[PDB]
């Protein structure tokens, strides 16, 4: 069908690490208004790309084809090959991002039980490489039950959302109030409406580059093609509904975490305001909490802007949100891993590039891209060695923005030149909308960082001109 | 011929304002080694572009001449039309830069002799507007004295160079020693071999963006291909010889000004060393001068890094170098203005763009582009309103780097796709050298500043795709 076929597995790929780990932090540094602006600006790009993908899907009656097959048969081989290569690399790095998020969650779990391995960052590296190896092992042999693991992942994420909302509704406990979360309060909402840039990554585009991986994952709907009853109707509805619902979830979580947790807090339970005259400051002082020492000293360990795991603390039952993080990360990383490998294998089936034709060999009876799986695993491990979401996320934002700009401009190019095999039937496709989407995607790509955007653009130009020549 | 027709024409357009006003200051902030590296890196781009230009001039046989005509007939309507518009805009801004340099020289002359008009920056604006109006009046009516003007300008620049080199060897007087000039000394050479990096523009690429317009002007030989004797053998040798000799002049001036003047000095003549047990701190102490007061407070008025007219101070007779600055700036500004107007008119006569076609008609009997002259004058005035050379220069570096990258990549594209017309006979043209030149030009363009490079590439892509579609 369309619901479970497209929208449920597009949500599972869109929801990932930044939903649970960095969205509260983005809402802390930027304002609620600025976080909403970031979310809507990412969703504009992803929705224009979704319209382009819907136009691609409703083009002809292409059967049994992945993302690369659809794009390269509806559009030209010159643009299709570059789109496939950039998309495969972006998914390979997204594997590293989601594995790093899962490893960070496991490392925090280990720390809370007081059993760390070596040290914060190296523990993340070890857990991430072990996780990604287990992910590769599952992807190679044992993916038959991923059709039933999808329901478990979706139900786990739903339970995590419900638990977070229920815990947010609960009035504060002493420990939670000490950690910064009191409750829905107008004063905290007004305080968090305005930006507060507090680090090296504190900037509007610095937070856009970290958030934007939250919006990617719409092309996961494209590679379903061939397992759908009616792609021309299933693909657009599923993709656009998933984009809309994940956008609603991001906005709701941002506006609800910005209205109940203060930016600065100290995990010390003694900071409860002592009776007397006092010189206590801060918004929390009105709720009996004197977090004055850490706020001025800039040595706070908790709060929205300091604690990277505030959704877990706020929720009524912390392990449920940890399970939700595990489900979201292991769904998104697996989807990216088995998307990059399949796109790369299909691309290597087409003798379009000189050196990448070795990775196009299948293994077993399902012709699975074992060589592509190993290359994606190697790239994922290499980017995992970084072991920092705030550094890996800007790379993935750059490469997914490049892929989306490429898709939008390729659709525009096919429309404006009146390509022989480009007669999309999607009602809401406009070539000028696609051009606007590609232009804004490139502008944002250069705005996040200029050198990586230039590298991606140069790679795209090299591939496109090589196929042209 | 090739000497006066081509090489001297390219000489007078390459030699400009940065040679007299900012090269000693670039040598002060970046040191002699990095200034030479900047000069050689700019000359690499300009010589690789000159090889492509020489290949264009030897391709087929064109009798009418003109930069845009040659490039478009040898390379195609799309690439040729993009080049003929970016180059025209770059030449229009070059008029603003050279007029601003002339206005700055006149403002300094007014300050030293007489009284200023309104304000040191507003005086630059007023003098620049008046001088560019006079240049426009000369261009519209009175363009028959050009051979005499070329001879006078070349002779005055030769006299300025000779007088500077003669006064540099002269042992320093009390005033010159106070201002920081101590003839030739190894200690000053060693001290100035290393960077200083003061001010907001202290940067390797910040200095490259200001120096680079000193290397542009290599397209003056191709402008008169029709009016030559044998372009296929005159344009290449003339362009390459002009590039080589101007490179030699820049390297020599940088090396001798680095080894003569200290970075920090005070115009006060009382700053001679007192005969006692003092606390003298600078290198000039060994030469008998005490510049500690301003050097420690960063309030020195003179020196290599503080005085923009130290080249005139060092020389034997300042008025000769003032005349040399006037000649160089006026020759370069006139060449840029007439080249922009003539390229724009020829581009507009070929109906490749919708609205520019209005600036395509000539006036009088020789069909001068009066509308093109007025548009170039308007752009020049708009950029003159910015009365800072260090602000206009990075813009011209960006646009001339874009033009040179476009020419190089257009030649490479015509070579690789085996274009029909494209059959260059130049012995030293290689398509891979052109590709390297285009790539490094784009990389440098983005390294100077990323947003202006992005705007230039966006305009280039817009024009190219408009002609393609
Ligand atoms: C893309 C962005 C930069 C990054 C580039 C990354 C790649 C760089 C490396 C490139 C060299 C690639 C290998 C060449 C050697 C192997 C042969 C081969 O590949 O086939 C062909 C090359 O293949 C191509 O077409 C490459 C095209 C690169 C385009 C780069 C454009 C940069 C524009 C920047 C400015 C844009 C405009 C700016 C305007 C302001 C060559 O075939 P051949 O050998 O000629 O055939 C026989 C002839 N011969 C043997 C006698 C010679
Ligand atoms: C690697 C990942 C990223 C890849 C993509 C990277 C970005 C690539 C972006 C490329 C953008 C290229 C835009 C120009 C070329 C297409 C439009 C055009 O001008 O041709 C058209 C002329 O149209 C006009 O000239 C009138 C003005 C409207 C169109 C141009 C607006 C955008 C201008 C530039 C703005 C962007 C400047 C910066 C970007 C260059 C020809 O067709 P038409 O006559 O319009 O026909 C109308 C048909 N209709 C009647 C059905 C409507
Ligand atoms: C979904 C669309 C995208 C956007 C959605 C964004 C939606 C949310 C956006 C913003 C919510 C944030 C604004 C309200 C918070 C600040 C104001 C406030 O509430 O203050 C009051 C509490 O309010 C309550 O008791 C309940 C409030 C929230 C109920 C649940 C929120 C929706 C949860 C469902 C998830 C969302 C729905 C999804 C459902 C599918 C308390 O005020 P005070 O300061 O204590 O009073 C002062 C008195 N004193 C001074 C005397 C002490
Ligand atoms: C096959 C083709 C491509 C593959 C090539 C791979 C090349 C591999 C090379 C490098 C790969 C690794 C990059 C460096 C990692 C740097 C990390 C870093 O911190 O950088 C820092 C700087 O860094 C730079 O600014 C330099 C950027 C390098 C140029 C990229 C060349 C490739 C373009 C391809 C061709 C294009 C053609 C275009 C066509 C239209 C960021 O710092 P900043 O912000 O500058 O700091 C200023 C601070 N301030 C302002 C506050 C004072
Ligand atoms: C084709 C050209 C290729 C080259 C281009 C670049 C060429 C120019 C490049 C470099 C030349 C300039 C830099 C080196 C010399 C100054 C630095 C120095 O070392 O000071 C020393 C040398 O000083 C002199 O040599 C003075 C006499 C010649 C000065 C230069 C004349 C013009 C050179 C260009 C003419 C035009 C060239 C082009 C014509 C077309 C003096 O120091 P000292 O204190 O006396 O030493 C005492 C040491 N002790 C105290 C320990 C005992
Ligand atoms: C393909 C060819 C056509 C298209 C080309 C691509 C289009 C764009 C082409 C060129 C634009 C490139 C960027 C320009 C702005 C740079 C920033 C700047 O210098 O601001 C200056 C504004 O100076 C003033 O005081 C007001 C006068 C500004 C006149 C120029 C405005 C642009 C108009 C003509 C351009 C459009 C002409 C369009 C013609 C069709 C002030 O300087 P600052 O940086 O703020 O401060 C620096 C420190 N400082 C204070 C000491 C100085
Ligand atoms: C057809 C038309 C196309 C052209 C449209 C014209 C648009 C005209 C819009 C603006 C022109 C006028 C001047 C703009 C700003 C000047 C002021 C300034 O100093 O900016 C500041 C930066 O901020 C930016 O980065 C601006 C970036 C957006 C401009 C590029 C968008 C246009 C791209 C085109 C589309 C391409 C798609 C194609 C790619 C393949 C300078 O800051 P910095 O120092 O440099 O940054 C670091 C500063 N720091 C010191 C704090 C660290
Ligand atoms: C980063 C941001 C600034 C991106 C900017 C995108 C623009 C370059 C695009 C977006 C929508 C485009 C427009 C969409 C619709 C049209 C109408 C079109 O005219 C038609 O022939 C059909 C419509 C009509 O009848 O006018 C001409 C192109 C134009 C103006 C397009 C010009 C280019 C626009 C403004
Ligand atoms: C001093 C340095 C730092 C200046 C900048 C480097 C250039 C001098 C280099 C960089 C890339 C080089 C080019 C890269 C590739 C080629 C292809 C090469 O092709 C051939 O050999 C063609 C003849 C044949 O072998 O059949 C000729 C040299 C050339 C143009 C190179 C010439 C020298 C270039 C421009
Ligand atoms: C906050 C910073 C960003 C602010 C943007 C605000 C929020 C945007 C969130 C994204 C929504 C953007 C979606 C894309 C909108 C532009 C895209 C608009 O949709 C394209 C339109 O073409 C669709 O309509 P058609 O082209 O066919 O014409 C209509 C067909 N009917 C109606 C005749 C049947
Ligand atoms: C703030 C915490 C974030 C939580 C806020 C946002 C809520 C998260 C977003 C989740 C929104 C919900 C997504 C789930 C899908 C909603 C959107 C549903 O999509 C359309 C359905 O009608 C299709 O479903 P079915 O054909 O299965 O019919 C269902 C009815 N029967 C068949 C079972 C009887
Ligand atoms: C100080 C560092 C300097 C860096 C600058 C280097 C600058 C560029 C190289 C410089 C000097 C050039 C040396 C001499 C001038 C070129 C001299 C070589 O060119 C002779 C030209 O007339 C024509 O080239 P050809 O003679 O090979 O053939 C012409 C075309 N037809 C007849 C076959 C059709
Ligand atoms: C096949 C193509 C492959 C790539 C080819 C070449 C790649 C090598 C290029 C990298 C060399 C550059 C290394 C970067 C050096 C350190 C890079 C340090 O970054 C500084 C520059 O990005 C910016 O300089 P500015 O911002 O000062 O310029 C003027 C703007 N202001 C003054 C107004 C602020
Ligand atoms: C709340 O706690 C803060 C912690 O800084 C108190 O601030 C300090 O108070 C003591 C005096 O009793 C001294 O350390 C200084 O007066 C303050 N130092 C700093 C670092 O601010 C504050 O007095 C407390 N206010 C109450 C009682 O609510
Ligand atoms: C070189 O100049 C410095 C700076 O003026 C002199 O050092 C100062 O000497 C006078 C008188 O002793 C006082 O202003 C201070 O004691 C010194 N420092 C400053 C910052 O002024 C130094 O004496 C001079 N050396 C000479 C003339 O040989
Ligand atoms: Cl995510
Ligand atoms: Cl995606
Ligand atoms: Cl110059
Ligand atoms: Cl030039
Ligand atoms: Na995602
Ligand atoms: Na997920
Ligand atoms: Na010049
Ligand atoms: Na000149």
Numbering used by the authors:
A (entry chain B), B (entry chain A): 137 to 605
From the paper:
The sodium-chloride cotransporter NCC mediates the coupled import of sodium and chloride across the plasma membrane, playing vital roles in kidney extracellular fluid volume and blood pressure control. The first branch is Na+-dependent cotransporters, composed of two Na+-K+-Cl− cotransporters, NKCC1 and NKCC2, and one Na+-Cl− cotransporter, NCC, responsible for ion import. Thiazide-sensitive NCC has been treated as the drug target for hypertension by the first-line clinic drugs, thiazide diuretics.
The high resolution of NCC-TMD EM map enabled accurate atomic model building for the TMD and extracellular domain (ECD). Of note, TM1 and TM6 are broken at the lipid bilayer’s middle region, forming discontinuous sites suitable for ion binding. One Na+ and one Cl−, assigned as Na1 and Cl1, are located in the substrate pocket formed by the antiparallel broken helices of TM1 and TM6, corresponding to the conserved binding sites of K+ and Cl1 in NKCC1 and KCCs. Cl1 is mainly coordinated by the main-chain amide group of Gly152, Val153, and Ile154 from the discontinuous break of TM1. Sandwiched by both the negative ends of dipole helices of TM1a and TM6a, Na1 is well accommodated by main-chain carbonyl groups from Asn149, Ile150, Pro349, and Thr352. In NCC, Na2 is coordinated by hydroxyl groups of Ser467 and Ser468 from TM8, and main-chain carbonyl groups of Ala464, Trp151, and Leu148. In NCC, Cl2 is consistently coordinated by main-chain amide groups (Gly353, Ile354, and Leu355) from the broken helix of TM6 and the hydroxyl group of Tyr540, a conserved residue from TM10. The extracellular gate is closed mainly through a conserved salt bridge in CCCs, which is formed between Arg158 and Glu240 in NCC.
